[PDB]
Design a protein around this ligand. Structure first.
Ligand SMILES: *[C@H]1O[C@H](CO)[C@@H](O[C@@H]2O[C@H](CO)[C@@H](O[C@@H]3O[C@H](CO)[C@@H](O)[C@H](O)[C@H]3O)[C@H](O)[C@H]2O)[C@H](O)[C@H]1O
Length: 319
């Protein structure tokens, strides 16, 4: 194996209002040669958001051939460049804005999605894991543990080996994790390869919009302090963990120092991270680490420094 250092490659999920949308206009897959740059930077694990509505435009029906073939090609490019890919269903536990478990989107439809995903890509060597749902929140919170078991059951029908990244309620917040995660203790995986994946940003409101600077009394351990509730819950309940989303702006050294402190804490506990974000068409996005002319990405140097640290033998923390 598990790389502690990885990146999100975002784009295939953009412009949720345009369904199905057109590739190259509303959403974007990595062009040819994209993964070569990141491979040569020493990054070998990628989290890849996908939009459920584009992969499966009708519930319980087969996957869209056009959208799924773009995923096929992406996985092919990743394989050629020694990139391991975590597929992320980036849908906030909703399908066309309706929560999984309501009458319009029963858990059996979500189970059907995960079956087809695993059936189609269980054989691709570039596929590393399944992040079965990005950030359940709000009215999805109480229904999410039942939906999660259905997603687990869906993958495990066709993929009995690969890890399952299980996110939590309340945008899978690492800071608030123990206040919701106990309902995930009843989740079952016959393969015993479940990893819980929480998210964290270090701006004031923790939204990752970074509308403000670090601030006068900024605490460098803010990142560690916001993941401590998550990591302690992992140790207390003997579970494995993962940080699927974290990013910072490039315009203040205090952000970088806080990121350094977080990566060390995650290293000490063997918790992998997926930086948010890289991607082929982020433009002026403030958290982007994709190369752009005239823009410095000091976050990448920090990622490379910690990628050089001996990858942990399994997901931490150790029991
Ligand atoms: C975790 O929190 C992240 C920070 O809020 C959040 O990032 C948001 O990601 C979406 C896409 O997944 C972005 O929307 C796209 O933004 C570009 C313009 O920057 C636009 O062209 C696209 O059409 C939008 O879809 C959004 O800007 C980010 O804030 C993650 O998604 C969360 O999982």
């Amino acid at each position: 194996s598990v790389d502690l250092i990885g990146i999100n490659v975002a784009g295939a999920e953009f412009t949720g209002g345009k369904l199905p949308g057109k590739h190259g206009t509303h959403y974007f897959f990595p062009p040819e040669g994209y993964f070569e740059y990141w491979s040569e930077q020493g990054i070998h694990t990628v989290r890849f958001p996908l939009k459920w509505e584009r992969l499966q435009p009708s519930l319980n029906a087969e996957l869209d051939d056009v959208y799924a073939s773009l995923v096929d090609d992406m996985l092919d490019q990743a394989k050629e460049n020694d990139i391991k890919v975590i597929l992320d269903v980036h849908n906030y536990a909703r399908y066309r804005k309706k929560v999984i478990g309501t009458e319009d989107v029963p858990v059996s439809a979500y189970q059907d999605l995960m079956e087809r995903i695993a059936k189609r890509w269980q054989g691709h060597d570039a596929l590393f894991a399944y992040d079965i749902m990005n950030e359940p929140y709000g009215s999805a919170d109480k229904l999410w543990p039942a939906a999660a078991q259905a997603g687990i059951d869906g993958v495990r029908k066709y993929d009995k080996k690969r890890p399952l990244l299980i996110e939590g309620a309340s945008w899978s917040s690492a800071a608030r994790w123990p206040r919701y995660a106990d309902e995930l203790l009843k989740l079952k995986d016959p393969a015993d390869n479940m990893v819980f994946s929480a998210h964290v940003f270090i701006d004031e409101d923790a939204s990752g919009s970074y509308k403000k600077g670090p601030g006068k009394d900024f605490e460098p351990m803010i990142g560690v302090k916001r993941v401590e509730p998550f990591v302690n819950w992992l140790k207390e309940h003997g579970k494995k963990g993962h940080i699927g989303e974290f990013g910072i702006p490039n315009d203040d050294e205090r952000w970088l120092d806080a990121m350094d402190k977080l990566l060390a804490y995650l290293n000490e506990n063997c918790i992998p991270i997926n930086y948010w974000a890289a991607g082929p068409s982020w433009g002026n996005y403030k958290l982007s680490i994709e190369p752009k002319d005239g823009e410095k990405r000091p976050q990448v140097a920090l990622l490379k420094k910690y990628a050089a640290k001996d990858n942990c033998s399994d997901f931490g923390p150790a029991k």
